[PDB]
Design an enzyme around this catalytic site. Structure first.
Site, PDB file in Angstrom:
ATOM      1  N   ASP A   1     -13.229   9.526  -8.490  1.00  0.00           N
ATOM      2  CA  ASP A   1     -14.334   9.719  -7.565  1.00  0.00           C
ATOM      3  C   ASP A   1     -14.110  10.764  -6.477  1.00  0.00           C
ATOM      4  OD1 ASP A   1     -12.630   8.327  -5.767  1.00  0.00           O
ATOM      5  OD2 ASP A   1     -14.343   7.310  -4.857  1.00  0.00           O
TER       6      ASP A   1
ATOM      7  N   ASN B   1      -9.114   4.937   2.630  1.00  0.00           N
ATOM      8  CA  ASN B   1      -9.884   5.874   1.817  1.00  0.00           C
ATOM      9  C   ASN B   1     -10.884   6.780   2.536  1.00  0.00           C
ATOM     10  OD1 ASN B   1     -12.424   6.214  -0.314  1.00  0.00           O
ATOM     11  ND2 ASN B   1     -10.399   6.563  -1.230  1.00  0.00           N
TER      12      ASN B   1
ATOM     13  N   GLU C   1       0.798  -1.217   0.000  1.00  0.00           N
ATOM     14  CA  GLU C   1       0.000   0.000   0.000  1.00  0.00           C
ATOM     15  C   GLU C   1       0.840   1.280   0.000  1.00  0.00           C
ATOM     16  OE1 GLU C   1      -2.996   0.521  -0.612  1.00  0.00           O
ATOM     17  OE2 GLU C   1      -4.071  -1.348  -0.183  1.00  0.00           O
TER      18      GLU C   1
ATOM     19  N   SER D   1     -11.939  10.972  -4.021  1.00  0.00           N
ATOM     20  CA  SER D   1     -11.544  10.536  -2.687  1.00  0.00           C
ATOM     21  C   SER D   1     -10.014  10.506  -2.620  1.00  0.00           C
ATOM     22  CB  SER D   1     -12.128   9.151  -2.363  1.00  0.00           C
ATOM     23  OG  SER D   1     -11.495   8.114  -3.104  1.00  0.00           O
TER      24      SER D   1
ATOM     25  N   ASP E   1      -6.604   8.461  -0.528  1.00  0.00           N
ATOM     26  CA  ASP E   1      -6.119   7.373   0.333  1.00  0.00           C
ATOM     27  C   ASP E   1      -5.032   7.978   1.204  1.00  0.00           C
ATOM     28  OD1 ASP E   1      -7.703   5.444  -1.025  1.00  0.00           O
ATOM     29  OD2 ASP E   1      -6.172   5.374  -2.607  1.00  0.00           O
TER      30      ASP E   1
ATOM     31  N   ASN F   1      -7.713  10.169  -5.860  1.00  0.00           N
ATOM     32  CA  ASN F   1      -8.422   9.384  -6.860  1.00  0.00           C
ATOM     33  C   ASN F   1      -9.319  10.343  -7.629  1.00  0.00           C
ATOM     34  OD1 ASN F   1      -7.724   6.471  -5.887  1.00  0.00           O
ATOM     35  ND2 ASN F   1      -8.451   7.509  -4.026  1.00  0.00           N
TER      36      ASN F   1
END
Length: 130
Positions: A49, A60, A35, A51, A53, A46
């Protein structure tokens, strides 16, 4: 902070991650590795959409933490996403545990399915004293 392998393994064990909801420490290590490379200030927007992380587990903002800029989001961990960018991973660990209490468990992270699921992850904790 960029954790070194064994340093992180002991930190997670100390925080109660070893076998949490049946998830071995080696799995958590494989997740953090893929990750973020064990990096707590890691971030990924992102564009698709809106969002983002956050942190070592790349949690998220759409459902887990509040950053105030993700549309119709939720804050299941009841934390500011900033809390997931600390050198101290206690808050990220509390949130990661919150994530796995849901049906999917460790499968919530697609990176885990891609790089850890059905794989030999023994190597992540070898020699760490955990």
């Amino acid at each position: 902070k960029v954790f070194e392998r064994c340093e992180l393994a002991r930190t997670l064990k100390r925080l109660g991650m070893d076998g949490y909801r049946g998830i071995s420490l080696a799995n958590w290590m494989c997740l953090a590795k893929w990750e973020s490379g064990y990096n707590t200030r890691a971030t990924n927007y992102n564009a698709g959409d809106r969002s983002t992380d956050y942190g070592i587990f790349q949690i998220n903002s759409r459902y887990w933490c509040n950053d105030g800029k993700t549309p119709g989001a939720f804050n299941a961990c009841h934390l500011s996403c900033s809390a997931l960018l600390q050198d101290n991973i206690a808050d990220a660990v509390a949130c990661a545990k919150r994530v796995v209490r849901d049906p999917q468990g460790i499968r919530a992270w697609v990176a885990w399915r891609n790089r850890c699921q059905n794989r030999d992850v023994r190597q992540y904790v070898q020699g760490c004293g955990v």
